[PDB]
Structures are given as C-alpha cells and as structure tokens.
Paper text:
The plant-type carotene desaturation system is mechanistically linked to redox chains in which quinones, the alternative oxidase PTOX and molecular oxygen participate. This is contrasted by the phytoene desaturases of the CRTI-type prevailing in archaea, bacteria and fungi which are capable of catalyzing the entire desaturation sequence including one cis-to-trans isomerization reaction at the central double bond. For the conversion of colorless 15-cis-phytoene into red-colored all-trans-lycopene CRTI thus takes over the function of at least four enzymes employed by cyanobacteria and plants. The observation that highly purified phytoene desaturase CRTI-His6 from Pantoea ananatis very efficiently converts 15-cis-phytoene into all-trans-lycopene in the presence of FAD and in the absence of any other cofactors or metals speaks for FAD being the sole redox catalyst involved. Since in CRTI-mediated desaturation in vitro redox equivalents are transferred from phytoene via FAD to oxygen the system behaves formally as an oxidase.
Native, enzymatically active CRTI was crystallized in the space group P3221 with one monomer in the asymmetric unit. The structure of apo-CRTI was solved at 3.0 Å by multiple anomalous dispersion using selenomethionine derivatives. The model was further refined against a 2.35 Å resolution native data set to an R-factor of 19.1% and an R-free of 22.9%. The structure of apo-CRTI is composed of 19 β-strands (forming 5 sheets), 12 alpha-helices, and three 310-helices. Altogether these fold into three pseudo-domains consistent with the flavin containing amino oxidoreductase family (Pfam: PF01593) as revealed by structural search comparisons (see the topology diagram and structural alignment in Figure S3 and Figure 10, respectively). The first, the FAD binding domain is composed of a five-stranded, parallel sheet sandwiched between a three-stranded anti-parallel sheet and a five-helix bundle. The ligand binding domain is composed of a seven-stranded mixed topology sheet with two alpha-helices packed onto the top surface and two, two-stranded anti-parallel sheets and two 310-helices packed onto one edge of the bottom surface of the sheet. The third domain packs against the rest of the bottom surface of sheet 4 and is composed of a six-helix bundle. The final model showed several disordered regions, and of the 492 CRTI residues only 404 are visible in the electron density map. No density could be seen for residues 34–40, 138–139, 195–196, 275–302, 331–343, 426–455, 465–470. Structural analyses revealed that most of the disordered regions (i.e. 34–40, 275–302, 426–455, 465–470) are involved in the predicted FAD binding site and therefore order-to-disorder transition should occur upon FAD binding and membrane binding (see above).
Numbering used by the authors: 1 to 33, 41 to 137, 140 to 194, 197 to 275, 303 to 330, 344 to 425, 456 to 464, 471 to 492
C-alpha cells in the first residue's frame, strides 16, 4: 500500500499520524524543521500548560500503551502567581485554605466576602448547569492585555466580584482568573465557579514540549510509522483531482494515497534567556502587573526550572518572557532597533523587581519580534492548547479512515 503523507502540522499532525498508523494505515510523517537548545539550556515557548491530559492519554490507549511509559507529567504548584509592581503577590491554586490565608493578608473582611461570593455563585449555577477542564492561556490574556480592563467580559466579572470583595488586588486577581480559565476574553461568572466544582491541576512534561513531541514520535514509530526529517515540501504531484506524490526541495519524491496538512489584537514579543543561577523564588508561571486599580497585565514570565531542572545545566535557569506589542505594521516600528532596546528594558525591569543579579548571570538569549514571525479528493486539512490541537486531529482521522477503508 502507498503510505499516507502527514505534512508537519505540529501536535495535530503527530496525533493524526498516530491515529492513522494505529488503524492499520502506513504513514509517512514529514518534518520540515518549537523547541531550541543552546549551551545546555532548553528553550520552549510552545504552550507548556497541561490541565487536561485525557486527549493525550487517549492516543497512547490506541496502541494499548499509557502516557507515563513515554512521558512523565509533573504537577505545577501554585498554578501561577500574580505579581504587582507594588510588591503584592497572589498565588493561585484550588486549595480554599491557602486562598483564604492569602485573602486574610490583603483584607480580613474579604475571607467572609469570598465565602459569601462562592455561596451566592453556587446557588446561581446549582441547577441546569453542567464539564470541560479549565485551560490557562496566558498568551491569549496578554494579546488582549492593553484593553484587558476595557473589555465587557472584565467589567461584568469585576462588578460581580466587587459586590462581595472590597480589596482592589483581590477584585483584580479573581477577575483575571475568571477570564484566564474562561479561555475567550463571556460575561457569565460560571467559568470562575465551575473551575472549583472539579479537581484539576497544572502539569508540565519532564523535558518540556520536546519530550512530549519525542514520546509521541516514539509511539508513532512503535506503531510502524516513518518520520522524514528536513522535509521541505516543494510541490504536490497531481493526476486528475488526486495527489499522486509529494515532492521535496532536495529532489525526493514520495508516492502517496492521501495528504494531510495545516491550512495554506496586540502582537507578542518573545525573549528567551538562560542564567547561570537558578531563581528558586519564582513560580513556574508568573503574571506581572504594572501601572498603565492603576495596574494591568504587562509581562508573562515562564520559569520552568522550579518544576524541571533538566531544562538547564546544574545550578542554572532557563526562562522566557512575553511582552504585548502593537500589531506588525500598526505602529511603523523597526524591530532591528526596537527589539534589542525592549530586550534590555525587560532585563532591567525583571532584575529590579523579581530577579536580582539577572544581567550578571546571562549566558545566552534570543528574541522573537513580530518581524521574525513573518477540488483535490485525497487532500485533508488538519483541524485549547496542546490537548485541543490533538483532539481536532481525531475528527480528521475519522474522515480519512472512512475514505481509506
Ligand atoms: Cl509596527
């Protein structure tokens, strides 16, 4: 049988290839060339937030395997930390005792205000309401961050929290969490409350994103699939309304039954950096608030070494920071000059407020500015973070299997 070709498509393409291969279809997975490594430091900005691994576990169950045999998921505690430039901190988790102890520190009166807020909200959603595990997208929150407090979803949730909670930092903390677990900055408080109706946590794969990719590739190969590396697609070869073969830039030609591939608000500035010191005082996920309450979401810091020390050399740290920037073309910016300047301003800010001796500890770093981000019968388009990408591959697999079998 001619193999079925899956062209890149990240976690979606990898999940699709696994489901086709598990079903008896010979697959060729083409990787063009999400995780970068330099001087012993491992850098991934590929969404690390795992709250619901069930869609991943479901792929491994198809081969009669378990995810744990290939990938170890590490619990992240707290889920994240909210940091105000003023020095105030709020550690988010699902433990009412640890939440109340923090609320007590901001405003004693707000512990009862919080309990009353939960009692009222539970009563509203007691009947006729179901659900889905909350998914944390710091990127999506940050891409809407300048206009965060401006939004109708924020205003509505803020006024609902404000009816019970008097403290400004606490009104901001709960409103932020509601919009974060909601996924789409939805005026209804159900999302904030539903989060607690279920036992959920934050997980991180040992080795990060790269180890999850590698475990899925190993699963794919154990099922009999083949991986083509440095596969730069030049064009498709056609006969009638069908693709006969996939052609690569290097001259390789692969005969195929079917082809599956990917489709073909503020911007974000990414800054990866490696330090020769492990900042053990940081949370894995940090949401930084700054002025222009008179403070809003300004930086996201990912410090995965507090959970996984394998991401950097011994006594070192691997980090990334996201900063919201105007959309490319929108502010007539020269990212060749603006990028190094923003990088240096970010370093100074993080050192001043959260990471002492940052600059003197720098080993390596890299920026990704908005500039850097620049009929057929047997052709299929592949397509909530990683589990959401993986789950969308399930529908493509079903459709492809019906046409192949
Ligand atoms: Cl611009």
């Amino acid at each position: 049988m001619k193999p079925t070709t899956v062209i890149g498509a990240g976690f979606g393409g990898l999940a699709l290839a696994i489901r086709l291969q598990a079903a008896g279809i010979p697959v060729l997975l083409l990787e063009q060339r999400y995780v970068y490594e330099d001087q012993g430091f491992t850098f991934d900005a590929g969404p690390t937030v795992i709250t619901d691994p069930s869609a991943i576990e479901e792929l491994f169950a198809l081969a009669g395997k378990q995810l744990k045999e290939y990938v170890e998921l590490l619990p992240v505690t707290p889920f994240y930390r909210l940091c105000w430039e003023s020095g105030k901190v709020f550690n988010y988790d699902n433990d009412q005792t640890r939440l109340e102890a923090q609320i007590q520190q901001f405003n004693p009166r707000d512990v009862e205000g919080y309990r009353q807020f939960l009692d009222y909200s539970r009563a509203v959603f007691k009947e006729g309401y179901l659900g889905t595990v909350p998914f944390l997208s710091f990127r999506d929150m940050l891409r809407a961050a300048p206009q965060l407090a401006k939004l109708q979803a924020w205003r509505s949730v803020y006024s609902k929290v404000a009816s019970y909670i008097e403290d400004e930092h606490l009104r901001q903390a709960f409103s932020f969490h509601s919009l974060l677990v909601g996924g789409n900055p939805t005026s209804s408080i159900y999302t904030l409350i539903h989060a607690l109706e279920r036992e959920w946590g934050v997980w991180f794969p040992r080795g990060g994103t790269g180890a999850l990719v590698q475990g899925m590739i190993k699963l794919f190969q154990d099922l009999g699939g083949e991986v083509v590396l440095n596969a730069r697609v030049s064009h498709m070869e056609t006969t009638g309304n069908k693709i006969e073969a996939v052609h690569l830039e290097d001259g390789r030609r692969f005969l195929t039954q079917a082809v599956a591939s990917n489709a073909d608000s503020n911007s974000l500035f990414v800054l990866y950096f490696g330090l020769n010191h492990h900042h053990d005082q940081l949370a894995h996920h940090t949401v930084c608030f700054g002025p222009r309450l008179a403070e809003d979401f300004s930086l996201y810091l990912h410090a995965p070494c507090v959970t996984d020390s394998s991401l950097a050399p011994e006594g070192c740290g691997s980090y990334y920071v996201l900063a919201p920037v105007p959309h490319l073309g929108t502010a007539n910016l020269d990212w060749t000059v603006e990028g190094p300047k923003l990088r240096d301003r970010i370093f100074a800010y993080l050192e001043q407020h959260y990471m002492p001796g940052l600059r003197s500890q720098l080993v390596t770093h890299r920026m990704f500015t908005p500039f850097d981000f620049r009929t057929i019968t047997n052709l299929y388009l592949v397509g909530a973070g990683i589990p959401g990408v993986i789950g969308s591959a399930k529908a493509t697999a079903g459709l492809m299997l019906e046409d192949l079998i």
